Scaffold this active site. Structure first.
Site, PDB file in Angstrom:
ATOM      1  N   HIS A  44       0.808  -1.268   0.087  1.00  0.00           N
ATOM      2  CA  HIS A  44      -0.016  -0.094  -0.035  1.00  0.00           C
ATOM      3  C   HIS A  44       0.918   1.274   0.009  1.00  0.00           C
ATOM      4  CE1 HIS A  44       0.649   1.058   4.083  1.00  0.00           C
ATOM      5  NE2 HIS A  44       0.967  -0.016   4.579  1.00  0.00           N
ATOM      6  N   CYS A  92       3.390  -4.612   6.727  1.00  0.00           N
ATOM      7  CA  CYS A  92       2.770  -4.400   5.448  1.00  0.00           C
ATOM      8  C   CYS A  92       4.044  -3.797   4.454  1.00  0.00           C
ATOM      9  CB  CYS A  92       1.901  -2.981   5.716  1.00  0.00           C
ATOM     10  SG  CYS A  92       0.410  -3.636   6.089  1.00  0.00           S
TER      11      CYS A  92
END
Length: 339
Positions: free
Chosen positions: A268, A286
């Site tokens: 992301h 992440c």
């Protein structure tokens, strides 16, 4: 011994007859004039007589908990014969409905398993596997493995070959799935494998390199999980993608978010760590990349494509994550876990 002979695929007085198969009748030494099958309210079941008059079959699903009466008349140069039988279908204790992924007509990546999820725990896993008919073209060996009591997956040993058509027929209607549980309905799906897209994040270089059919198309500096909360090594299947989402640990406004594990790993947009990307791991696990690169990923990576993480201080992504199927070695996957 000269009048027609009539046979049927069911026996008179039978009980517990399963409704996964049509009922047929055949004549020898003659032709079927007429065949009817009715329930105990006198309602006919649809059927069709072959042009040659030698075979009749039902053409719609028989119901549970029903008694059906079959009447057939055949005629031949040796005279007539009329015959009748009655039988009773399965009476389930409970029904369970299947749900198949990926979606019908979709194009998916080379990592996409076939997934069949039931809304009840399956007692007889082997009955469920036998009821699921997967066709591949070009043909390839694959195998079933259960992620949990409600969801089974099927995949080949290696990533799928691009251009492969996959047809999935979940023929669970009328099948006894154990403990009196029977299939509620059948489901199907057909899908196609697209281009090979494999994105490797190497913690030694902190670069996420996307390769399409083997060839580098994009390099992305990244920042992965800091040592306290590392990104697990392994093979991850690309899932859903979101333009904007609320990333919360109880499960940071985040844009261009591509999910790669059920455990919550995403690729992301991380404007707040751009200076760290390519140098220092900083996230909760992440794969942080630039707003720009995140949108590239969102636009060009599809469900079923692969992300491989390597050389992190983390352990390995679990094979039963949801998107971690490829981390189970083939001998284990193929041996399965039906019992």
């Amino acid at each position: 011994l000269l009048v027609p002979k009539l046979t049927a695929s069911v026996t008179d007085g039978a009980v517990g007859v399963t409704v996964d198969a049509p009922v047929s009748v055949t004549a020898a030494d003659g032709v079927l004039a007429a065949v009817t099958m009715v329930n105990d309210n006198g309602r006919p079941v649809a059927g069709r007589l072959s042009p040659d008059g030698l075979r009749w079959s039902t053409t719609e699903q028989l119901g549970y908990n029903r008694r059906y009466t079959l009447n057939a008349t055949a005629l031949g140069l040796g005279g007539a014969a009329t015959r009748q039988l009655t039988f009773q279908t399965s009476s389930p204790a409970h029904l369970t409905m299947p749900y198949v992924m990926p979606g019908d007509g979709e194009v998916v990546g080379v990592g996409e398993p076939v997934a069949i999820r039931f809304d009840e725990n399956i007692a007889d896993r082997g009955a469920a596997e036998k009821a699921i008919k997967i066709t591949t073209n070009p043909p390839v060996e694959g195998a079933f493995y259960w992620l949990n009591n409600r969801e089974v997956r099927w995949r080949p040993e290696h990533f799928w070959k691009p251009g492969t058509a996959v047809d999935v027929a979940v023929n669970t209607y009328g099948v006894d799935l154990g403990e009196g549980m029977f299939g509620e309905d059948n489901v199907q799906t057909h899908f196609t494998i697209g281009d090979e897209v494999i994105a490797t994040a190497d913690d030694n270089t902190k670069i996420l390199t996307v390769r399409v059919n083997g060839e580098v198309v994009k390099s992305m500096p990244t920042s992965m999980g800091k040592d306290s909360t590392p990104t697990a090594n392994g093979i991850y299947i690309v899932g859903s993608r979101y333009k904007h989402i609320i990333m919360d640990s109880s499960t940071t406004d985040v844009d261009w978010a591509t999910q790669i594990s059920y455990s919550g790993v995403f690729v992301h947009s991380a404007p707040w760590s751009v200076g760290a990307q390519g140098h220092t791991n900083t996230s909760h696990g992440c794969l942080n990349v630039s707003p720009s690169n995140a949108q590239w990923f969102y636009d060009h990576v599809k469900r079923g494509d692969i992300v491989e993480v390597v050389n992190t201080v983390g352990g390995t992504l679990p094979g039963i994550d949801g998107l971690g199927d490829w981390n189970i070695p083939w001998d284990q996957w193929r041996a399965g876990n039906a019992k």
